[PDB]
Structures are given as C-alpha cells and as structure tokens.
Ligand binder design. Sequence first.
Ligand SMILES: Nc1nc2c(c(=O)[nH]1)N=C(CO)CN2
Ligand SMILES: Nc1nc2c(c(=O)[nH]1)N=C(CO)CN2
Ligand SMILES: Nc1nc2c(c(=O)[nH]1)N=C(CO)CN2
Ligand SMILES: Nc1nc2c(c(=O)[nH]1)N=C(CO)CN2
Ligand SMILES: Nc1nc2c(c(=O)[nH]1)N=C(CO)CN2
Ligand SMILES: Nc1nc2c(c(=O)[nH]1)N=C(CO)CN2
Ligand SMILES: Nc1nc2c(c(=O)[nH]1)N=C(CO)CN2
Ligand SMILES: Nc1nc2c(c(=O)[nH]1)N=C(CO)CN2
Lengths: 121, 121, 121, 121, 121, 121, 121, 121
Amino acid sequence: MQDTIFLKGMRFYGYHGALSAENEIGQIFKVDVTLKVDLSEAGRTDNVIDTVHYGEVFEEVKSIMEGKAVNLLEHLAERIANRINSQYNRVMETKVRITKENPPIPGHYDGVGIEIVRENK
Amino acid sequence: MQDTIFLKGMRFYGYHGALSAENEIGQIFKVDVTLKVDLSEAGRTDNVIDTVHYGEVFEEVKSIMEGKAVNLLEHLAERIANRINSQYNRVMETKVRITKENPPIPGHYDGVGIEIVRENK
Amino acid sequence: MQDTIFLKGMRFYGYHGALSAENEIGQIFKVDVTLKVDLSEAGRTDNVIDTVHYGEVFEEVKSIMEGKAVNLLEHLAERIANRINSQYNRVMETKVRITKENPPIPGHYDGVGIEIVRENK
Amino acid sequence: MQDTIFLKGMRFYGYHGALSAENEIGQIFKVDVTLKVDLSEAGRTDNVIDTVHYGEVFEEVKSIMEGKAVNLLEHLAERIANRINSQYNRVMETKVRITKENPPIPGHYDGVGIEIVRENK
Amino acid sequence: MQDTIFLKGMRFYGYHGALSAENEIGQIFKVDVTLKVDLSEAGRTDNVIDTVHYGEVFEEVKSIMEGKAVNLLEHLAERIANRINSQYNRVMETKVRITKENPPIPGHYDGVGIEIVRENK
Amino acid sequence: MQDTIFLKGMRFYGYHGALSAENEIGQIFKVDVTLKVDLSEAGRTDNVIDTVHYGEVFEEVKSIMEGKAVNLLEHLAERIANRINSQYNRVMETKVRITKENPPIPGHYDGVGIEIVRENK
Amino acid sequence: MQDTIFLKGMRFYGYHGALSAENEIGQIFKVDVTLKVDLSEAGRTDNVIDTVHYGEVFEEVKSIMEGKAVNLLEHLAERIANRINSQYNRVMETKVRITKENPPIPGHYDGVGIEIVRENK
Amino acid sequence: MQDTIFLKGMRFYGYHGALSAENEIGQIFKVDVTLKVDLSEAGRTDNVIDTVHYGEVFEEVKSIMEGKAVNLLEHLAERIANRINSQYNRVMETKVRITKENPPIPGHYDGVGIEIVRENK
Ligand SMILES: Nc1nc2c(c(=O)[nH]1)N=C(CO)CN2
Ligand SMILES: Nc1nc2c(c(=O)[nH]1)N=C(CO)CN2
Ligand SMILES: Nc1nc2c(c(=O)[nH]1)N=C(CO)CN2
Ligand SMILES: Nc1nc2c(c(=O)[nH]1)N=C(CO)CN2
Ligand SMILES: Nc1nc2c(c(=O)[nH]1)N=C(CO)CN2
Ligand SMILES: Nc1nc2c(c(=O)[nH]1)N=C(CO)CN2
Ligand SMILES: Nc1nc2c(c(=O)[nH]1)N=C(CO)CN2
Ligand SMILES: Nc1nc2c(c(=O)[nH]1)N=C(CO)CN2
C-alpha cells in the first residue's frame, strides 16, 4: 500500500529553538508531511468524505508550527504526527520533516533538520 | 527489476477540487508518473515497439488531467494509473503523484498532494 | 552496503529519439549515474586506486551519450550500465537515469525519462 | 525506526582532490548528513539533552571538510561518519553524501559524488 | 511615468521557427510582456475599467503564440505588441520578450531570444 | 543618487482580485519594494536613526497586503507607495512591484503583475 | 530603438584564466549576449534574411569561448563583441556578459564576472 | 562606457544588525558588487595588470563583510564601496548591493536590503 496524501514545503515563521536569541527573533520553518492512506475508496467514489482532506491537515500543522515555542524540531514533529494520527484513523503512518534553512550555524548549507515516521495505532 | 520510464513535472491547468470556487477559476496541477517496465528487451533491440512509448503515456495523462472535473486528486490519480495499466501490459506497476502547488490553503508552502502506486494485474 | 559514487545532472547534447525530426535537431539529455561500490577500503587508505574514479565514469557516459544516435533512452541507458559494469569490477550495481527535459511532447512538464538498475555479474 | 536528524546542503570551500591543480585552487563541496536517531524521548521531554544537537554535528562536519586535504570524497565521508558515530551513541546509522558540483570534468552536469551509510557499533 | 502592468514567464507550446524540423515537433516559448500604463487613476478608484485587465492581455498573447506558425521570434513579438497597442489606448508602450529555452542549437545555455519595445501611437 | 533600501520577494496570502471566486479562496502575492534614499549619512554614522528601517517598511507593506481586499494590484501598490512616502521623508521615490504567480489565467507562465514608481513630494 | 535579439546563459567549458592551475583543469563559463537590432523589418516580412540569425551568433560565441585560452574574461568578451559587430552590420551595439560561477576564490557566492557594451561602427 | 567587472551572490556569514539578538546568532549576507571599468585596454592586451583583478576585490568585500559588526547594511556597503574606490583608480563607479535573505522579520519574502552607487573621485 504505497498510496499517499502529501503537503510539501509548508513554511511558517516561528520562534522554536534551544537558544534564547532564536526564540526571540524567529525564522522560517519548512515542513513536509506525507501520509500513508489507502486512496482506493476515494479513488472510485470521488467523495471527499472517503479520504483525508489536505486542507484540514494543513490547519493542524499550522496550529503547532505557529503555536507555543519549543526547543526542538523533534518535539514539534512529534506533536504534529501525534495530532494527525489521533484525528484521522484512515491515516496508517505519518512522516513529518521539518527543515531550518537558516538556523544559528556559522556556515554555508541548504538546511538542517529532522524527519520522523509514526504509525497510527 | 528496478527499471523505469518516467514523466516528471507534467503541468496541466485544470478545474479539479472539492470547493466550487476552485472548480470555477482552476489552477496548475503538476503530475509525476513513474512506470515499472523491464527495459532489457528494448535495451538490446533499440526498437520502440518493445518498450512503452512515453509520448503516448503523456497523452493518456493529459486526457484525464484536462478532461472532466473531479473533486479529489486521489480520484484523478486512480483514473490515470488505471488508464496506463489497462493499455500497457508491459507496465508492471504505475506510480502517480499529483501536486497542487497553489491550492485553496492560507499559508506558505511549496505544495500539497497525493501519490498512489498500483500494480497492473 | 549503501555506499555510492554518483554523477548527477550530467548534460549532453545529442540526436537520440524515435522521430527523425529530433534525430535532426537534437536536444539536451540529462543523466544521473549512481554506483554501488564498497568505499571502506578507499575510505581508510585515501588511495584513488581502491575506488572507482568518477572522472573516468563520466568519460564513459559521455562516449555513449555523444556517440551514435539511437531511438530509445532505454537503449542508451542499457549501453551505459553495461559499459560501467564491464570495466569496473568494484561496481556491484549501476543505476542510470536519463531525462529528456524538452522532448517532442505538446505540453507543460519538467521532464520525462527512464531509469534502470543493473547489477554487475 | 525511521526518525532522522538531517543537515542538507552544507557547503565548505576545500582543497580535496586527486589532481594537484585542484588541491591548489579548491572548490565548493556540498555535504548532506542524515542520522538515524530515535527521537521519541526528546519528542516527549523537549529537552535538548535527549537528542543529538545538530549544531554540534555541523561543527564536526566542518572540522573535516575544512581541515587537512585528502584525495577522495570517499575518505572525507568515511572520516565524517566515523566522527559522528564515535561521539554520539544515540546515532544508530550515519549517511554522508558529498557532492562536487564543479569537479575537474570537461562537460555539462549538475554534480558528481559519493554517498556512504555506516551503522554505529 | 514608470508605472507598469506585467505578465512574466508565460509559456506556450508552439511550432514557430525557421527550420522545418522545429515547425514539426515544436517547443516551449517563454514570453514576458511589460506595459507602460499610468495606474494612478485605477490606483485611486479601484475600478478595473480604469486600467488594462491583465487577463485580457494574456488572451491576446496566447492567441498569437498558439496560432499560425511563423519563422521568427521577431515577427511573433511584433504581432503581439501591435495587438496590444491597437486594442488598448491606455497602453503607452509595449515591451515583448520571447525566449526559446531549447532552440535547435548544439550547446549549453539557459536561453536565446529577442525583446522589442513599441510605443502606441 | 542611486542608493536604495530594498525588500525583495515579500509574500502575503491575500484575497485581492476583480473576480469574486478569487476574493473567496485567495492566493499568494509577491511584493518587491525599492526605495530611493541617500544612505551616505547612515553610511558614516552607523546609526539606524539616519536611514529608513526596513523592518518598519515591511510592517507597512504587510498591513496593506494583508488588510482589506481590493480589486486591483494597481490600487494595492498605490496604497503601499503612498503609505511609505507619507511616513518617511528620507524616501525620495518608492517603487512597488506586485506579482500574482498564480492568477485566474488558464495557461503556463511564471507570473503577471504591475510595477509603479512614485516620488515623495 | 529598444529592440533586441538575445542569447542567455550559454555555457561552455573552457580553460581561460590568469592562474595556470585553472588553465589546466578549466571550468564552466556562462555567457549572455544581447544585441541592439531594429526588428521592425523582419517583424513585418517574417523573412530570416532581414534579422540576425541567433544560431549563427551562438556559433560565433562558441568559437571564441571554446577556442584558444586567454587570461581575462575582458579579453574573451572583447573578442566576442568584435566578432559579432564585424560580421553583422544590422547589429548596432553588442553587450557581452561572462560569468565564472566557480572561479579560484575561497568563499561563498553565486558568481563573478564582467560585462562590456560595444557599438558597431 | 558600459563595461563592467562583477561579483554576484557573494555570501558571508556575519553578525551585522541593529538588534542584539542578531549580532549574537548571525546570518548569511548576500553581496553583489558591480564595477564601472573601461576594459578596452585589457581587452586588447590580455594582460591582467590593465584591468581590476576580481579575486582581489573579493578579498576586499570579504574583509569587510567578515570583520567587525555594524548595525546597518548601508554602512557595510559604504565601507565596501569606499574600499574599492580608494585602491583601484581604474574603477570609475562602485555599486554594492547587500541582501539579508533571512532578516528578523516575521513573514514570507525572498529578501530585503540596500544598494548604493558611488563614483570614484
Ligand atoms: N487528501 C485531499 N484533501 C483535499 C483534496 C484532495 O484532493 N485530497 N481536495 C480538496 C479540495 O480543495 C481539499 N482537500
Ligand atoms: N519509454 C519511451 N518512450 C519514448 C521514447 C523513449 O526513448 N522511451 N522515445 C521516443 C522518441 O521521442 C518516444 N517515446
Ligand atoms: N569515485 C571517485 N572518483 C574520483 C574522485 C573521488 O573522490 N571519488 N576524485 C577525483 C579527484 O578529482 C577523481 N575521481
Ligand atoms: N537535532 C537537533 N539539534 C538541535 C536542535 C534541534 O531542534 N534538533 N535545535 C537547536 C536549537 O538551535 C540546536 N540543535
Ligand atoms: N492590470 C490588471 N489586470 C487585472 C487585474 C489587476 O489587478 N491588474 N486583476 C484582475 C483580477 O483577477 C484581472 N485583471
Ligand atoms: N534600511 C534598513 N533598515 C534596517 C536595517 C538596515 O541595515 N537597513 N537593519 C536592521 C537591523 O535588523 C533593521 N532595519
Ligand atoms: N534573431 C533570430 N535568429 C534566429 C531565429 C529567430 O527567430 N531570431 N530563428 C531561428 C529559427 O530556429 C534561427 N535563428
Ligand atoms: N576583472 C578580472 N579579475 C580577474 C580575472 C578576470 O578575468 N577579470 N581573472 C582572474 C583569473 O582567475 C583573476 N582575476
């Protein structure tokens, strides 16, 4: 079952980070959420009720990325995956990738971050 | 057997979507189709008849992405995969990814979408 | 063993294609070659003789992509993989991806193509 | 366990290479480091002490990419993976990808390079 | 008066070109149209009737880029500028840039093309 | 006097547009604001009080792009330029460019929009 | 007279440079050539004989960028502009921009280079 | 005299900024330096001594962008232009553009910055 619903490159300005200066000025956070969902039912019916509505998922990601500040990307991603898994039983597994394209690191790079994969129980 | 024929970043303007406003103005839809096909025969013969002609596949994708409007990306992708699997027995599995780079979602992101994988029976 | 030597986005102007008009004007062909090679020996010795020299591989890819014209990307990729596998015993598997970013297809897309994976016997 | 901490597109100017001319003028080296780390502990605690701090990892990559010159990308990557595995027991596997976007190769391409994956024992 | 209405990167698949092979397979044509129009009236009134509607302009560009085939980009651009100048008296000057990103030229480049500027009399 | 302070590629999700469907779903608006300001005073003193603070300008652009909906880009740009000219006497001329990368237009293009230049009296 | 014929982002691998190491390994050179040519004649006639054929210009640029090695970009650009001005009387002014995206400079940047503008006498 | 020597997209990590938090963590600064220099002498002689060596200019830009911290981009740019004008009499005018792609601004944008043009007396 390799069917998925995805939201790529979501960007939210937030104040997450371990260092107080970054909690102070903030930065853009890029998020990729991929969901394992069997889309064969919606595929035949064309009824939105038989799949996971991506607009709602975005709202969920937004609510966490733009809510209270946390020290780690790991924790934000854990909160996001848990949020999605809890409210959508059709989702079998949630993968969340959060990239800091401009973190507090003296150097030249495209980005740093984390990715976690969590099955829905 | 990890041989494939691919069509990346196809873009079609369409009126698909669950919300009537988007069925009204439309938007660009980006499609990636990857096909599992054993290319060792064509690889030795150099005869187009022994592989799946990518131009034809494109025509198939186009016909669906630019035809009648549907509510979900899941359904468009299901129609595409089924179309390709039905007409090309050499295709062992069809993966279709459809991305909405600018869907009806208030925010900043690179894209949202779905991907399904369907073996040809 | 997930060690690799890679050459990404190689571009050669060539006259390959099934339709005579394209054999006539040509186009750019983008090639990605990934090689499964155990790099632990070179990793400790730092001697180029214990790994596969990427410059040589490029020469091999170039010689095929810029040589005689063929009808299919499948056949070019098969010739490339076979070339690399034959001359480099350290290579355990050769993956070749060839993309036509601007093929003879009326539409909007980022690219179409094929990818094959061939183990060295 | 598909949880990861990543650092994408790090870029360092260095003098690594087999040919003396390139050891002489140098070039930019792009590095991607992906780490297999269980982030469920940090995910619940929000304490940086329970995950691998990405800033430190960067420092490690930097120290190698910008230190003494070596002939092969394989060797730089082997040194990086070994460095990370040695100092971070929470890391279960280190993947390092080093790309030379502008190596000593007469042609047109996006990049050439290597990728290795090393589990921490 | 440095006010403008612009349409950047329009892309149309067409069969324009001096060589019969290219009139045969076609290619994508990228068009940039910039219009010198005093926008102070619309700027205060917020009524679409006091400015040049960009949607209509696009229709005009489309009609030419996707209509009958011509040998030169110069001629397509001349037809476009004349079309816009004739139907929109508010337009004081029309600049049209047409780029062939993949013309019949053996080599490596981002694009070739022409740009003309025509005042409306 | 060719000194400038600039803010490139600002992006705001808004509901501006002449067609009610677009006022309904919205889209991203990209804004470039360039300001003619003599920076020789700040250049020698290094005191923020002698130049125009770019953070404040952004706040001004944001307030308009994210406030009440209007039919035309011309009007949004006129409001922005007037806002900046009114509150910053050091600004000699304000140029505002607003691009709709995904407007209600059936086709393939990079963007459409307007640019106005307004001197401060 | 703001009409132009352009060739953007041409790329040639060459061995130009003041330092012997770079004359030894080479690098990619990106060239932009813009030509001031009145296109109103070709614009009405649609005959290639009344404009400057861009394919030929490319051949000229290629012949210099890929011929004998020189120390400076200034000199390559001077040779190119002079070549174009000499053979095409319809060309009123030739602008040549040559960029070294990866020159012998320890640092992070997108490119360095020169641009010259030469009227045809 | 529209001849120029340019250095585009130089990137340096620095601690410049008016707010103490940003002086603390830093960020990447992108710099474009364009120089008005008559290149006809070097164009005929091919001797580096008759033009301005771009490598040296880079060293100058680097020394300022990576040296002592200042509050404003205006001041950094003023120091750079003055540095270049003082040491290179062949330079008739220096244009410096400094972009902060990720400044302390809550929002979505590509960049903010300043550009100054200074003739050499
Ligand atoms: N997974 C998913 N969610 C959606 C979809 C869709 O096609 N798939 N379409 C929508 C209409 O805007 C809204 N939400
Ligand atoms: N899979 C596949 N399809 C094709 C190919 C090709 O090389 N592979 N070449 C074509 C010639 O334009 C047309 N169609
Ligand atoms: N796989 C591989 N091939 C190479 C390498 C290298 O580091 N790895 N370095 C080279 C020096 O330019 C030349 N060729
Ligand atoms: N893996 C990891 N390392 C970090 C993180 C983080 O969120 N994850 N946050 C930091 C604060 O800048 C510093 N270092
Ligand atoms: N010049 C111009 N043309 C338009 C504009 C606009 O803002 N400016 N808005 C439209 C609404 O989609 C349609 N057409
Ligand atoms: N024009 C301008 N505005 C600013 C500047 C600056 O350097 N120039 N620096 C700031 C510090 O974040 C804030 N605002
Ligand atoms: N300036 C110019 N040169 C050309 C043109 C063209 O349209 N303009 N078209 C060609 C056909 O490939 C060949 N050469
Ligand atoms: N303006 C300028 N400066 C240079 C040039 C060049 O061609 N032009 N070439 C160099 C050789 O690396 C070094 N420095």
